[PDB]
Write a protein that binds this ligand. Sequence first.
Ligand SMILES: [Cl-]
Ligand SMILES: [Cl-]
Ligand SMILES: [Cl-]
Ligand SMILES: [Cl-]
Ligand SMILES: [Cl-]
Ligand SMILES: [Cl-]
Ligand SMILES: [Cl-]
Ligand SMILES: [Cl-]
Ligand SMILES: [Cl-]
Ligand SMILES: [Cl-]
Ligand SMILES: [Cl-]
Ligand SMILES: [Cl-]
Ligand SMILES: [Cl-]
Ligand SMILES: [Cl-]
Ligand SMILES: [Cl-]
Ligand SMILES: [Cl-]
Ligand SMILES: [Cl-]
Ligand SMILES: [Cl-]
Ligand SMILES: [Cl-]
Ligand SMILES: [Cl-]
Ligand SMILES: [Cl-]
Ligand SMILES: [Cl-]
Ligand SMILES: [Cl-]
Ligand SMILES: [Cl-]
Ligand SMILES: [Cl-]
Ligand SMILES: [Cl-]
Ligand SMILES: [Cl-]
Ligand SMILES: [Cl-]
Ligand SMILES: [Cl-]
Ligand SMILES: [Cl-]
Ligand SMILES: [Cl-]
Ligand SMILES: [Cl-]
Ligand SMILES: [Cl-]
Ligand SMILES: [Cl-]
Ligand SMILES: [Cl-]
Ligand SMILES: [Cl-]
Ligand SMILES: [Cl-]
Ligand SMILES: [Cl-]
Ligand SMILES: [Cl-]
Ligand SMILES: [Cl-]
Ligand SMILES: [Cl-]
Ligand SMILES: [Cl-]
Ligand SMILES: [Cl-]
Ligand SMILES: [Cl-]
Ligand SMILES: [Cl-]
Ligand SMILES: [Cl-]
Ligand SMILES: [Cl-]
Ligand SMILES: [Cl-]
Ligand SMILES: [Cl-]
Ligand SMILES: [Cl-]
Ligand SMILES: [Cl-]
Ligand SMILES: [Cl-]
Ligand SMILES: [Cl-]
Ligand SMILES: [Cl-]
Ligand SMILES: [Cl-]
Ligand SMILES: [Cl-]
Ligand SMILES: [Mg+2]
Ligand SMILES: [Mg+2]
Ligand SMILES: [Mg+2]
Ligand SMILES: [Mg+2]
Ligand SMILES: [Mg+2]
Ligand SMILES: [Mg+2]
Ligand SMILES: [Mg+2]
Ligand SMILES: [Mg+2]
Ligand SMILES: [Mg+2]
Ligand SMILES: [Mg+2]
Ligand SMILES: [Mg+2]
Ligand SMILES: [Mg+2]
Ligand SMILES: [Mg+2]
Ligand SMILES: [Mg+2]
Ligand SMILES: [Mg+2]
Ligand SMILES: [Mg+2]
Ligand SMILES: [Mg+2]
Ligand SMILES: [Mg+2]
Ligand SMILES: [Mg+2]
Ligand SMILES: [Mg+2]
Ligand SMILES: [Mg+2]
Ligand SMILES: [Mg+2]
Ligand SMILES: [Mg+2]
Ligand SMILES: [Mg+2]
Ligand SMILES: [Mg+2]
Ligand SMILES: [Mg+2]
Ligand SMILES: [Mg+2]
Ligand SMILES: [Mg+2]
Ligand SMILES: [Mg+2]
Ligand SMILES: [Mg+2]
Lengths: 174, 174, 174, 174
Amino acid sequence: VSQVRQNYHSDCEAAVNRMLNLELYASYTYSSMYAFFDRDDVALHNVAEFFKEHSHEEREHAEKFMKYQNKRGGRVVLQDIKKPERDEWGNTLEAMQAALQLEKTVNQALLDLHKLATDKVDPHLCDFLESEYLEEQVKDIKRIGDFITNLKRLGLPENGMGEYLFDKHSVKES
Amino acid sequence: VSQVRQNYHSDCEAAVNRMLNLELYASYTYSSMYAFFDRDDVALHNVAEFFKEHSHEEREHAEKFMKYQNKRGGRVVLQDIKKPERDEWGNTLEAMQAALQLEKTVNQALLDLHKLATDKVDPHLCDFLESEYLEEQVKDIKRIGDFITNLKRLGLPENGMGEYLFDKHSVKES
Amino acid sequence: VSQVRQNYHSDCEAAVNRMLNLELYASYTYSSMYAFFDRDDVALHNVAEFFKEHSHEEREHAEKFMKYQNKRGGRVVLQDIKKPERDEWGNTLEAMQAALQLEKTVNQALLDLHKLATDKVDPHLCDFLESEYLEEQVKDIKRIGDFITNLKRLGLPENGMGEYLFDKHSVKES
Amino acid sequence: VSQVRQNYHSDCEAAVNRMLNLELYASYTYSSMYAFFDRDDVALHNVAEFFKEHSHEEREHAEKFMKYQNKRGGRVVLQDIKKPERDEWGNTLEAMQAALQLEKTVNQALLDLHKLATDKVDPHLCDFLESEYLEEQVKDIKRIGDFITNLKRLGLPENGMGEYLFDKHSVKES
Ligand SMILES: [Cl-]
Ligand SMILES: [Cl-]
Ligand SMILES: [Cl-]
Ligand SMILES: [Cl-]
Ligand SMILES: [Cl-]
Ligand SMILES: [Cl-]
Ligand SMILES: [Cl-]
Ligand SMILES: [Cl-]
Ligand SMILES: [Cl-]
Ligand SMILES: [Cl-]
Ligand SMILES: [Cl-]
Ligand SMILES: [Cl-]
Ligand SMILES: [Cl-]
Ligand SMILES: [Cl-]
Ligand SMILES: [Cl-]
Ligand SMILES: [Cl-]
Ligand SMILES: [Cl-]
Ligand SMILES: [Cl-]
Ligand SMILES: [Cl-]
Ligand SMILES: [Cl-]
Ligand SMILES: [Cl-]
Ligand SMILES: [Cl-]
Ligand SMILES: [Cl-]
Ligand SMILES: [Cl-]
Ligand SMILES: [Cl-]
Ligand SMILES: [Cl-]
Ligand SMILES: [Cl-]
Ligand SMILES: [Cl-]
Ligand SMILES: [Cl-]
Ligand SMILES: [Cl-]
Ligand SMILES: [Cl-]
Ligand SMILES: [Cl-]
Ligand SMILES: [Cl-]
Ligand SMILES: [Cl-]
Ligand SMILES: [Cl-]
Ligand SMILES: [Cl-]
Ligand SMILES: [Cl-]
Ligand SMILES: [Cl-]
Ligand SMILES: [Cl-]
Ligand SMILES: [Cl-]
Ligand SMILES: [Cl-]
Ligand SMILES: [Cl-]
Ligand SMILES: [Cl-]
Ligand SMILES: [Cl-]
Ligand SMILES: [Cl-]
Ligand SMILES: [Cl-]
Ligand SMILES: [Cl-]
Ligand SMILES: [Cl-]
Ligand SMILES: [Cl-]
Ligand SMILES: [Cl-]
Ligand SMILES: [Cl-]
Ligand SMILES: [Cl-]
Ligand SMILES: [Cl-]
Ligand SMILES: [Cl-]
Ligand SMILES: [Cl-]
Ligand SMILES: [Cl-]
Ligand SMILES: [Mg+2]
Ligand SMILES: [Mg+2]
Ligand SMILES: [Mg+2]
Ligand SMILES: [Mg+2]
Ligand SMILES: [Mg+2]
Ligand SMILES: [Mg+2]
Ligand SMILES: [Mg+2]
Ligand SMILES: [Mg+2]
Ligand SMILES: [Mg+2]
Ligand SMILES: [Mg+2]
Ligand SMILES: [Mg+2]
Ligand SMILES: [Mg+2]
Ligand SMILES: [Mg+2]
Ligand SMILES: [Mg+2]
Ligand SMILES: [Mg+2]
Ligand SMILES: [Mg+2]
Ligand SMILES: [Mg+2]
Ligand SMILES: [Mg+2]
Ligand SMILES: [Mg+2]
Ligand SMILES: [Mg+2]
Ligand SMILES: [Mg+2]
Ligand SMILES: [Mg+2]
Ligand SMILES: [Mg+2]
Ligand SMILES: [Mg+2]
Ligand SMILES: [Mg+2]
Ligand SMILES: [Mg+2]
Ligand SMILES: [Mg+2]
Ligand SMILES: [Mg+2]
Ligand SMILES: [Mg+2]
Ligand SMILES: [Mg+2]
C-alpha cells in the first residue's frame, strides 16, 4: 500500500486510469481534425487551429489525471491510445457534429466516475471532477452546439460560402 | 402632504408610477429576448447581448422614475411586472419588429405623460421627460428601424447567411 | 430535445425557472426598500444605497440562472414578477428583519433545489449552487443578522439618534 | 428699442428684474444664517459653511439673471435688497425650516415666471428657467427636506447631542 493512500478505492483508481486513456483518445481525435482542415484541399485554417487547441486541452486534462492518481497514491497504468474513428472528417459541420458526440462521451465518462466516487464515499474525487472537469465540459458542449446551429444556418454542407464565412467569423483568427 | 411637494399633481404622481411599471415591463421583455438568442438552437450572441444591454437601460430608466417621484414628494407604488408577450421570439427580424413596437409603446406613454404634465402646468416634469427620455427614445426607434431595413435587405427570415452576417456586422461585437 | 442536453432532468429545469423568478422577486423587494429609504420623510441614504446594491445583486443572480438554463439545454420560461409584500418598510430595523427573512426564503429555495439535483444525480447543478450561491447566501444572512443585533443595541425602533448613527457607521458611505 | 430685442415682452423683462431681486434677497438671508451659526454661542461651523455656500449660489443665480436680461435686450433695474426676516435663527432645525420655506418661495416665483413666459410665447425664457433653475431648485428643496427629517430624528430642538452630530455627519466637513 502507498504511504499516502487514504480513502481511495481500487475501483476509483482503475476508473481514473480509464479516464486518462479516454482524454488521450479525445486529444488524438482532435489532432486528426486539425490535420484534416490543414489539407490543401480543405484549407480552413481557423477551424484547423480550433481543433489543434482542443487537442492540447485534452492532453493537459490527461496529464491532470496522472498527477491526481499519484497525489492519491494510486498507480498510473497506460494503455494503447486508439486511432480516431475516421481518417477524413468531411467538412466543418461533420467535424463539429463528431466533436459534440466526443465531448458528450467524455462528459458521460466523467459523470459515471462521479457516480462511482459518490458510491465509494470519496468527496475529494467528487470535488476534483466538479471543480476541474464538469463545468468546463458543459461550456465546451454549449460552444460546439452553438457552432452547429450556425453552420446549419449558413447552409452547410452545400453552401461553401457559408463554410468560408464560419471560418472567418465564428472561430478565433489564428 | 410631503414637506417638499410643490406644483405636483396627484394625476402626475400616479402616471409616473405607471411609467415606472412600463419601463420595468420593457426591461423584462428585453431580458427574454436576450435569453432566446443565447439558446444553443438560436446562438446569435451579439444580438443576445444587444437585448441584454437594452434590458439594463430600461431598468435604469425605471430607477430614474423612482428617484424622480421621491424628489417631487410623490410616493412610489409598485405593481406586478407582467411577463413578456411571447416565450420565444422567432428570429432576429421578428424580435427587432417586437422591439420597435415596444419602443413606440413606451414613447407613446412618455408623450401622454408630457401632455398630462402640460395640462397640469408642471414645467419641471416636462423638462425631465424632454431632457432624459424623449430624445433617447427617438434615437432607439431610429436605430431599430435601421436594423429592420437591413434585416429585410439581408433576406430575413429565410436567409440564414444574412442573419449570421447581421450578428457579426450590425450589432457590436460582444 | 436540445442537442446539448445531457443528464438534465425536466424537474430541475422547471425548478431553475422557479428560482429565476424568486431572484427577480427578491430584487424587486430590495428596490422597494431603496425607494422607501430615499423618501424625504425617511432620508437614510446609505441604507437606501445598501438596498439598491442588493437589488442589483439579486438581478445578476437571476441572469446567472438564465445563462445556466441555456448552457444545460433547458428553456427559460418567465412568469410575472410579483410586487413586494409591503409598500412601506417602517424603519431600518423592520426593513432589515424583512431582508433577513427574504434571504432565508431564498436560501431555503436554493437548498431545496440542491436536494432535487442530488436526487436526480446532477453533480453539475449541485456544484453550480455550491460554488455560486450557497456561500454568498450564508454571508448575506450573517451580515444582516449582525446589522439587526446592532440596530437593537442602538435602541431601534424608538431611538432616532441610534438609527441615524447606524446609517453613518454600519453601511458603506454612498 | 434695443437692437437685439426679439420676442421679449415688457412684462417678462420686469419679472426678470423682480426675480433678480428675490435671488439677492435669498442670498442675504443665507448670509445671515452663516453669521448666526458662526457665533461663539452657537458654534456649528459646518452648518454655518453650508449656509455661506448657499448664499454664494444665490448671488451667482442673481448674476445669471443680469446677464440674461442684457442678452435679450432688456434693462437691469435694481431695487433695495431687504434685510432678512430674522436677526437670529434659533437652531439648526429652525434655520433649515426657514431655508425650506425660502427655497419654496423662490421656486414659486420661478414657476410664476415660467407661466408668464408661456403666456407671452417666449420659449427661450422657458428653456432658460427649465435648464438653469427649476431642477436645481427641486434638488435643493429635497436636500433640505431630507435634513429636516434627520434633525427631527436626532431630537431637535431639545437634543443638543443630536444637533452636534448633524453638524459632523450630515453637512460637508469645512
Ligand atoms: Cl485507501
Ligand atoms: Cl473515510
Ligand atoms: Cl480498495
Ligand atoms: Cl488500471
Ligand atoms: Cl483504458
Ligand atoms: Cl493496451
Ligand atoms: Cl482493443
Ligand atoms: Cl466519427
Ligand atoms: Cl474515414
Ligand atoms: Cl464519441
Ligand atoms: Cl467509472
Ligand atoms: Cl470545471
Ligand atoms: Cl456561436
Ligand atoms: Cl457562430
Ligand atoms: Cl403640490
Ligand atoms: Cl404653480
Ligand atoms: Cl393634486
Ligand atoms: Cl399609483
Ligand atoms: Cl402600473
Ligand atoms: Cl399588481
Ligand atoms: Cl392584471
Ligand atoms: Cl410580441
Ligand atoms: Cl411564444
Ligand atoms: Cl408593444
Ligand atoms: Cl399619462
Ligand atoms: Cl433624452
Ligand atoms: Cl444600421
Ligand atoms: Cl445595419
Ligand atoms: Cl437529459
Ligand atoms: Cl448520468
Ligand atoms: Cl427528464
Ligand atoms: Cl417552468
Ligand atoms: Cl415561477
Ligand atoms: Cl405569470
Ligand atoms: Cl398568482
Ligand atoms: Cl414583509
Ligand atoms: Cl405596506
Ligand atoms: Cl420572505
Ligand atoms: Cl426545488
Ligand atoms: Cl457562493
Ligand atoms: Cl455589523
Ligand atoms: Cl454594525
Ligand atoms: Cl420684443
Ligand atoms: Cl415670435
Ligand atoms: Cl412688450
Ligand atoms: Cl423693473
Ligand atoms: Cl424688485
Ligand atoms: Cl428700492
Ligand atoms: Cl418697501
Ligand atoms: Cl423667517
Ligand atoms: Cl429675530
Ligand atoms: Cl420665505
Ligand atoms: Cl412672474
Ligand atoms: Cl436646473
Ligand atoms: Cl440626508
Ligand atoms: Cl442627514
Ligand atoms: Mg512503502
Ligand atoms: Mg486496484
Ligand atoms: Mg484498430
Ligand atoms: Mg467551478
Ligand atoms: Mg474546456
Ligand atoms: Mg471538453
Ligand atoms: Mg473537457
Ligand atoms: Mg411631514
Ligand atoms: Mg394621489
Ligand atoms: Mg398573466
Ligand atoms: Mg429643455
Ligand atoms: Mg437633450
Ligand atoms: Mg436609449
Ligand atoms: Mg428606449
Ligand atoms: Mg427609452
Ligand atoms: Mg435540434
Ligand atoms: Mg420539462
Ligand atoms: Mg397581487
Ligand atoms: Mg466557494
Ligand atoms: Mg451576496
Ligand atoms: Mg442573498
Ligand atoms: Mg444570494
Ligand atoms: Mg439703438
Ligand atoms: Mg417695460
Ligand atoms: Mg424694513
Ligand atoms: Mg416646453
Ligand atoms: Mg436640466
Ligand atoms: Mg442648487
Ligand atoms: Mg435654491
Ligand atoms: Mg435655486
